[PDB]
Amino acid sequence: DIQMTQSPSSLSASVGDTVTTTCRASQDISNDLAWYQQKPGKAPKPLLYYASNLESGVPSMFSGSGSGTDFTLTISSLQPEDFASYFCQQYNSYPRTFGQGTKVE
Amino acid sequence: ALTQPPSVSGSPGQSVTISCTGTSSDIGSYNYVSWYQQHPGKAPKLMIYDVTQRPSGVSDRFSGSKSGNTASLTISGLQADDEADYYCSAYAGRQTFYIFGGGTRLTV
Amino acid sequence: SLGFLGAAGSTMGAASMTLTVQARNLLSHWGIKQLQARVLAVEHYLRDQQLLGIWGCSGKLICCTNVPWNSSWSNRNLSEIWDNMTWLQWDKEISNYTQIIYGLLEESQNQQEKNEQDLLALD
Amino acid sequence: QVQLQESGPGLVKPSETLSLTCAVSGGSFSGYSWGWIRQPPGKGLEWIGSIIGRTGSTAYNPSLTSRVTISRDTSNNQFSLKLTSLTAADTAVYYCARQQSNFDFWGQGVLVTV
Amino acid sequence: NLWVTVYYGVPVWKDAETTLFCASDHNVWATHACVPTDPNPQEIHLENVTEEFNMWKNNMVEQMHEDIISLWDQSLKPCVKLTPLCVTLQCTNVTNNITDDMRGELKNCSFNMTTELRDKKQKVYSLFYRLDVVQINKEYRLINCNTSAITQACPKVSFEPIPIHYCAPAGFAILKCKDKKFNGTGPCPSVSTVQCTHGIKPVVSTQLLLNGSLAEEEVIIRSENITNNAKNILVQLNTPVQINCTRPNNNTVKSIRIGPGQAFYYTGDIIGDIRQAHCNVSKATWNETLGKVVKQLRKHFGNNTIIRFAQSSGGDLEVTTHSFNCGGEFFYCNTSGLFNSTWISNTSSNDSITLPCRIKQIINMWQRIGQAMYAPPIQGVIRCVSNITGLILTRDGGSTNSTTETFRPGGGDMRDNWRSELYKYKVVKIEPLGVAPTRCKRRVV
Amino acid sequence: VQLVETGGGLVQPGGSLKLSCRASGYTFSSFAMSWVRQAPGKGLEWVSLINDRGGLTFYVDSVKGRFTISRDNSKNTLSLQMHSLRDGDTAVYYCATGGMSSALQSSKYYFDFWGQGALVTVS
Ligand SMILES: *[C@@H]1O[C@H](CO)[C@@H](O[C@@H]2O[C@H](CO)[C@@H](O[C@@H]3O[C@H](CO[C@H]4O[C@H](CO)[C@@H](O)[C@H](O)[C@@H]4O)[C@@H](O)[C@H](O[C@H]4O[C@H](CO)[C@@H](O)[C@H](O)[C@@H]4O)[C@@H]3O)[C@H](O)[C@H]2NC(C)=O)[C@H](O)[C@H]1NC(C)=O
Ligand SMILES: *[C@@H]1O[C@H](CO)[C@@H](O[C@@H]2O[C@H](CO)[C@@H](O)[C@H](O)[C@H]2NC(C)=O)[C@H](O)[C@H]1NC(C)=O
Ligand SMILES: *[C@@H]1O[C@H](CO)[C@@H](O[C@@H]2O[C@H](CO)[C@@H](O)[C@H](O)[C@H]2NC(C)=O)[C@H](O)[C@H]1NC(C)=O
Ligand SMILES: *[C@@H]1O[C@H](CO)[C@@H](O[C@@H]2O[C@H](CO)[C@@H](O)[C@H](O)[C@H]2NC(C)=O)[C@H](O)[C@H]1NC(C)=O
Ligand SMILES: *[C@@H]1O[C@H](CO)[C@@H](O[C@@H]2O[C@H](CO)[C@@H](O)[C@H](O)[C@H]2NC(C)=O)[C@H](O)[C@H]1NC(C)=O
Ligand SMILES: *[C@@H]1O[C@H](CO)[C@@H](O[C@@H]2O[C@H](CO)[C@@H](O)[C@H](O)[C@H]2NC(C)=O)[C@H](O)[C@H]1NC(C)=O
Ligand SMILES: *[C@@H]1O[C@H](CO)[C@@H](O[C@@H]2O[C@H](CO)[C@@H](O)[C@H](O)[C@H]2NC(C)=O)[C@H](O)[C@H]1NC(C)=O
Ligand SMILES: *[C@@H]1O[C@H](CO)[C@@H](O[C@@H]2O[C@H](CO)[C@@H](O)[C@H](O)[C@H]2NC(C)=O)[C@H](O)[C@H]1NC(C)=O
Ligand SMILES: *[C@@H]1O[C@H](CO)[C@@H](O[C@@H]2O[C@H](CO)[C@@H](O)[C@H](O)[C@H]2NC(C)=O)[C@H](O)[C@H]1NC(C)=O
Ligand SMILES: *[C@@H]1O[C@H](CO)[C@@H](O)[C@H](O)[C@H]1NC(C)=O
Ligand SMILES: *[C@@H]1O[C@H](CO)[C@@H](O)[C@H](O)[C@H]1NC(C)=O
Ligand SMILES: *[C@@H]1O[C@H](CO)[C@@H](O)[C@H](O)[C@H]1NC(C)=O
Ligand SMILES: *[C@@H]1O[C@H](CO)[C@@H](O)[C@H](O)[C@H]1NC(C)=O
Ligand SMILES: *[C@@H]1O[C@H](CO)[C@@H](O)[C@H](O)[C@H]1NC(C)=O
Ligand SMILES: *[C@@H]1O[C@H](CO)[C@@H](O)[C@H](O)[C@H]1NC(C)=O
Ligand SMILES: *[C@@H]1O[C@H](CO)[C@@H](O)[C@H](O)[C@H]1NC(C)=O
Ligand SMILES: *[C@@H]1O[C@H](CO)[C@@H](O)[C@H](O)[C@H]1NC(C)=O
Ligand SMILES: *[C@@H]1O[C@H](CO)[C@@H](O)[C@H](O)[C@H]1NC(C)=O
Ligand SMILES: *[C@@H]1O[C@H](CO)[C@@H](O)[C@H](O)[C@H]1NC(C)=O
Ligand SMILES: *[C@@H]1O[C@H](CO)[C@@H](O)[C@H](O)[C@H]1NC(C)=O
Ligand SMILES: *[C@@H]1O[C@H](CO)[C@@H](O)[C@H](O)[C@H]1NC(C)=O
């Protein structure tokens, strides 16, 4: 199986600020990493298909990048509504391993 | 059978050499001369194999060597528990597989 | 019971138990295209058999020889070769020495035949 | 605008077989993979398994394969999860989701205790 | 210590190029040469074998290409050579009960044709499609007159594709890649061995690949080099898109003897009104299909770019238009209605898209020059239903500062159609002899 | 690793006894096995050897016309059938692992794992 983790467990943040996080894999993933935003009590909201590609209805505030084993997620500014946890998912192999992390407070 | 001197002994803390003598066909021809020890009431244990090899679980105080048609086992650092009977054994060939020597009763 | 090449990927010491599985599948206009394919399969079969003949392995799938193994061809022990490698991996590891080994096998057999011929003339 | 509804029951704690049947509407099955994702309280997400809509072929998370069956019936636009020998660790929110590389659509996961 | 031991029957192999033969279960795709197939194939799964495949360097493609062309040509060997037809034609427009699109599309021609006896002539009046006739102002000639002799296809020989299985000779094996989402040009962790391929239908088309296999999970984008805009992109769909094609006009076919046991077939007249040939796809299915294709393209063309689809830029009708054989008739359908959209990441009835089609009787296949076939007309009305299983796309070149990529339909090189079925197969040679060290010594005397 | 012996005890001369050895903690089928005996007042004597597959057996000359060694890998069991027992055959018999290995394995011309034996008395 492909394991992966996020770097921060959480971030302290101001609303009027840019915050970033990362996701690192034990095995090479050919850009096939997705990102999600989760609020307590709800299913995760998809953000990114591939590290650099946004889904529908997702604002330009979100962006990302990466290839191989090293990936990143960037939020240019936050609304109070963006103080949520984030997930990264690899879909390069069957144990569809997710990483866990980056609660933003 | 292989010749192996009886009653070879020594004091605790000393070293002892227990020799084994065969012929040109038994020891002179093959590097397969193992050593075993036996406490009364127990099956023999392998101490040395091939000539100089030692199996896991056997301490480094036990070591063998050979020359010509003879071979030996030496024990350094003799301990209180080193009072087993010792035997040499060698691979003789295809017609005769194994030959054991006589026993040596080590005492300390 | 595995089928043809079923043991590919298994270790060398396992794969060696299926030698007859692979051996029996060897040898088993536009008509010209098909004949060329059939003729070629026969020629390849016969060339392998000729080498086995030359080396003194004509009737065997497993044949022991008198050529010592060189550590320079592969400085690897038996546990690694027979238990932790497949035949495909092995083939790559020593492909560079194939013609050295073959040359040695031929020379050894030639010497053996001369010796047999003379022993049979002892009277 | 695809919607997914898990429709799960509460379960017997010491031992039972879980059964969740997810209804799908606003789209169909032939072009997509469907599956289940679990989230025990206080934990992140893990995949359970999935089924291919057009062929019915499945794949499962290696850790629980001996206990899990996923199947589908496009007639009713439904698919379901069946888990045997449920024991404590199986308490989780179970989510229904549609996969097209990513997981595009999610339902409202159901908390099932064991 | 160790000795060389020789083993025979060792399960190893090498990449190889050999001659394959066909097998199968009248028609152009004659099964006369092909070996009857086995009651069932066998497949051996090879556990723990990872192998590398390359669909763009696969000699099975070249052999299929040569065999298909060969069968095509063999089927025309015994057919009538229509050389008496390369005469001046006197033609006027068909204006009788023609609709708005069918304007100048049909011409009514008259000519002095040969007959059974050499001292006799006959006057023949026939209808031709405009695309087959070139003006020399009522004087016309057939389009093939200045480049080739034309052969009439035999009326009793079907053009329906028959699945062909390719089989390896003894000493060789075909390895099959079972991986899902396999794009070619890689390691394939799940492989198996077969002796024969699945049956492949030699369906001939441009732009849209009909009646092939489908992907099981996702649309698969395959190319030799995705960043090279000079290369074609093959797209395999995971769902079929159904397309309904018709030639609505009810034709009456006439024939004349033009020589000693030879006859020519031609359209005499049209019974009803004259309408344009066309093909339908539903809007919902086509629009869903592109959304799936676009999502996958974004893997290679990421960072939220704009993906645009556009019409073929130019070239011969065969490349710019969707060519296919429908019931023996040869259609050239305009796909501008399928590739007219712009996609961005911010997005979202029996309504359908009708593609107008043109029809030709003089066909020049396989990009060859000097050969031509005359396709006899078919009496009655033609209807066929096909499954779109994949696409051929090309990409526009341009600067690297662009935020938009444009894709257009491509095709015309038949080998790329073949590659969509043969991408999972590789031919290897079995090399049964090998050596390894053991403790076994040959007995010396 | 354990080797456990069970079997017959006292027989009169000319009679027959059988011994059995069961073993576990290792792959039984990977090893050749041997019987060694010790007369009550003597040292060790090799009696017999069987390969891992079970097809090849060897004996000390003294028992060639009367002892049979066999194994059944599916039950992890080694056994020895003795006929025409002589007074000279009184000994503790032991089963042990080793004394031979296949051509694809490292040499193993020694015994390593021993059972505790069984006493065979002929009187
Ligand atoms: C993608 O795949 C589809 C499906 O295979 C192809 O579509 C088929 O094309 C064939 C060939 O044109 C069609 O076959 C023809 O059907 C006619 C009608 O048959 C009816 O009556 C028979 C009675 O026996 C029934 O069994 C049948 O079901 C129908 O009810 C026949 O009249 C035709 O025969 C005549 O022409 C042939 C030459 O073509 C002569 O050899 C015959 O002797 C006779 O004169 C013929 O059998 C078939 O119906 C189509 N299927 C569908 C669903 O439409 C697509 O063409 C293919 N696409 C591409 C690009 O290749
Ligand atoms: C492919 O490799 C696997 C190991 O990755 C092999 O699995 C072994 O199967 C035997 C069956 O008798 C078990 O006793 C072993 O314990 C398994 N090994 C491991 C590490 O679990 C499998 O046999 C190989 N397949 C082939 C055809 O050789
Ligand atoms: C094609 O041309 C032929 C001949 O020019 C047409 O047949 C003629 O039809 C007219 C009626 O409009 C008759 O008066 C003539 O006697 C016919 N001539 C012969 C000998 O056929 C035919 O109708 C035309 N067809 C079309 C569709 O244009
Ligand atoms: C055969 O005749 C055709 C028709 O006149 C020629 O094709 C034309 O070539 C000119 C070249 O400048 C193009 O501009 C026209 O558009 C072409 N017309 C068509 C209908 O294709 C063709 O070149 C001639 N072939 C030979 C060998 O002379
Ligand atoms: C098909 O899959 C293969 C395997 O993942 C891709 O090959 C990799 O391409 C990158 C970029 O050139 C190289 O850096 C890697 O080393 C290649 N991997 C291997 C194992 O060789 C290939 O690019 C994919 N094709 C398409 C069109 O996406
Ligand atoms: C795929 O095609 C592109 C375009 O031809 C190749 O990129 C060029 O590589 C050469 C040699 O390094 C450079 O001089 C050019 O400037 C590159 N052009 C561009 C637009 O980047 C690329 O190398 C090819 N891929 C492979 C695997 O061969
Ligand atoms: C393609 O779709 C068109 C509709 O857009 C079909 O044309 C209609 O056919 C019915 C008879 O079934 C007529 O009553 C309508 O007047 C026609 N409508 C139009 C706009 O022409 C057409 O038949 C379909 N073609 C195929 C091959 O399925
Ligand atoms: C192609 O033609 C078939 C009929 O041969 C169409 O299928 C019919 O669709 C209507 C409307 O949904 C149903 O009431 C009929 O029962 C269907 N018939 C059959 C045999 O399934 C199909 O929709 C057409 N497709 C396109 C793109 O025009
Ligand atoms: C296919 O049909 C389209 C649509 O009728 C044709 O598109 C025209 O192309 C010319 C030249 O680029 C443009 O000036 C026109 O504006 C386009 N038409 C429309 C409605 O936008 C196309 O030329 C046809 N192609 C073939 C091969 O027949
Ligand atoms: C999608 O639309 C919203 C409208 O509020 C806009 O803010 C956002 O930037 C758009 N996203 C993209 C990728 O264009
Ligand atoms: C091994 O190869 C070297 C040359 O590289 C040669 O000198 C040596 O004699 C060879 N040894 C054996 C056992 O063949
Ligand atoms: C073979 O060599 C490897 C690497 O040095 C070693 O780990 C392994 O124990 C060796 N095998 C044997 C039987 O000694
Ligand atoms: C075999 O020869 C190639 C050069 O053709 C070389 O690169 C490779 O390292 C050689 N293999 C070995 C095991 O030395
Ligand atoms: C045929 O149609 C064309 C349309 O461009 C017209 O110019 C020509 O005069 C017509 N010919 C006849 C005989 O009606
Ligand atoms: C047939 O030949 C005669 C010769 O006088 C000519 O007048 C007539 O136009 C020709 N007919 C056709 C259809 O070309
Ligand atoms: C089109 O796809 C359907 C899927 O159910 C299949 O039954 C049908 O045979 C396919 N048609 C062709 C021509 O392959
Ligand atoms: C052509 O139109 C005329 C006038 O409406 C009509 O009398 C004639 O029957 C029509 N012909 C056909 C084939 O429909
Ligand atoms: C991705 O788009 C952003 C604008 O939102 C731009 O600043 C960035 O440079 C682009 N990245 C790449 C690799 O083109
Ligand atoms: C492409 O779409 C535009 C906008 O709806 C339309 O005006 C144009 O005619 C379409 N092109 C074709 C070839 O249908
Ligand atoms: C096709 O998809 C586009 C996506 O933006 C949507 O706006 C349009 O309404 C859809 N059309 C049909 C017929 O489904
Ligand atoms: C074409 O017209 C003829 C008139 O005799 C009729 O028999 C035939 O059925 C018609 N064809 C079609 C497809 O309707």
Author numbering:
A (entry chain L): 1 to 105
B (entry chain F): 3 to 9, 11 to 27, 27A, 27B, 27C, 28 to 95, 95A, 95B, ...
C (entry chain B): 519 to 546, 570 to 664
D (entry chain H): 1 to 52, 52A, 53 to 82, 82A, 82B, 82C, 83 to 99, 101 to 111
E (entry chain A): 33 to 57, 66 to 144, 153 to 184, 188 to 309, 312 to 323, 323A, 324 to 400, 410 to 506
F (entry chain E): 2 to 52, 52A, 53 to 82, 82A, 82B, 82C, 83 to 100, 100A, ...
Reproduce passages from the article:
Here, we developed a method to determine mAb sequences directly from cryoEMPEM maps. This hybrid approach, consisting of electron microscopy (EM) and next-generation sequencing (NGS), enabled sequence assignment of variable regions of polyclonal Fabs (Fv) including the complementarity-determining regions (CDRs). We used structural data from the recently published rhesus macaque immunization experiments with soluble HIV Env trimers.
(B and C) CryoEM maps and models of the BG505 SOSIP complexes with Rh.33104 mAb.1 (B) and Rh.33172 mAb.1 (C) as Fab fragments. The final map resolutions for the Rh.33104 mAb.1 and Rh.33172 mAb.1 complexes were 3.3 and 3.5 Å, respectively. Atomic models were relaxed into the reconstructed maps. The structures revealed that both antibodies bound to the same epitopes as the pAbs computationally sorted from cryoEMPEM maps. The overlay of the maps/models from experiments with monoclonal and polyclonal Fabs showed excellent agreement in both cases. On the backbone level (Cα), the root mean square deviation values between the mAb and pAb model were 0.668 and 0.721 Å for Rh.33104 and Rh.33172 datasets, respectively.
